[PDB]
Amino acid sequence: YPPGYPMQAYVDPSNPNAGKVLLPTP
Amino acid sequence: SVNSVLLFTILNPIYSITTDVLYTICNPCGPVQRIVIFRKNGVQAMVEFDSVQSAQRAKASLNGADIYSGCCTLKIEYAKPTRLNVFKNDQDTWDYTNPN
């Protein structure tokens, strides 16, 4: 799996998967 | 109604969605058995896991995440079929328990 991913761009207290990026951009 | 099959609706599908992409992001959540991708009106995919527990781990971990930054936002629900029927292995459908 690409190092560093899934990556949490920011943490939203209302929504744990908001800001979550599963893979680097092709 | 829980299920071991999930329906992924991929909002804003800017990048190519293939069985390899979906296997890569889903199998760390739980063992994937089969994938079917529908491309007619947007992109939706069905992903069948080994168990309900794996499907629930995939749904909890990925629902509302983006596959790639700023796009490909995942809406995940339980699918209607309780198993997927796959007859070929390619970029659109795959059965990891039936090499052809």
Residue numbers in the entry:
A (entry chain B): 2168 to 2193
B (entry chain A): 190 to 289
What does the paper say about this structure?
The RNA recognition motif (RRM) binds to nucleic acids as well as proteins. Here we describe the mode of interaction between hnRNP L and LL with the methyltransferase SETD2. We demonstrate that for the interaction to occur, a leucine pair within a highly conserved stretch of SETD2 insert their side chains in hydrophobic pockets formed by hnRNP L RRM2. Notably, the SETD2 binding region in RRM2 is distinct from its RNA-binding interface.
The conserved 30 amino acid sequence of the SHI domain did not reveal any clues as to how it might engage hnRNP L. Hence, to further explore the molecular basis of this interaction, we determined the crystal structure of hnRNP L RRM2 in complex with the SETD22167–2192 peptide at 1.80 Å resolution. There are two complexes contained in a crystallographic asymmetric unit, with hnRNP L RRM2 chains A and C associating with SETD22167–2192 chains B and D, respectively. The hnRNP L RRM2 in the complex adopts a β1α1β2β3α2β4β5 conformation that forms a five-stranded β sheet packed against two α-helices. When bound to hnRNP L RRM2, SETD22167–2192 adopts a U-shaped conformation contacting the RRM dorsal helical face. Although all residues of the SETD22167–2192 peptide could be clearly traced, only a fraction at the C-terminus of this peptide (2183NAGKVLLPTP2192) was found to directly contact the RRM, burying ~477 Å of the solvent-exposed area of hnRNP L RRM2. In detail, the bulk side chain of SETD2Leu2188 is accommodated by a hydrophobic pocket which is lined by hnRNP LLeu251 from α2, hnRNP LIle214 from α1, hnRNP LIle256 from the α2-β4 loop, and hnRNP LLeu263 from β4. In addition, the side chain of SETD2Leu2189 stretches into a neighboring shallow apolar depression lined by hnRNP L Ile214, Val210, Ile256, and Tyr257. Furthermore, the residues downstream of the Leu pair, including 2190-Pro-Thr-Pro-2192, together with SETD2Leu2189, wrap around the hnRNP LTyr257 and hnRNP LTyr204, providing further binding affinity and specificity. Notably, hnRNP LTyr257 makes van der Waals contacts with both SETD2Leu2189 and SETD2Pro2192, playing an important role in hnRNP L-SETD2 interaction. Although the N-terminus of the SETD22167–2192 does not interact with the RRM2 directly, we found that the residues from substantial van der Waals and hydrogen contact with the C-terminus of the SETD2 peptide, possibly helping to fix the conformation of the peptide and thus, enhance the binding.
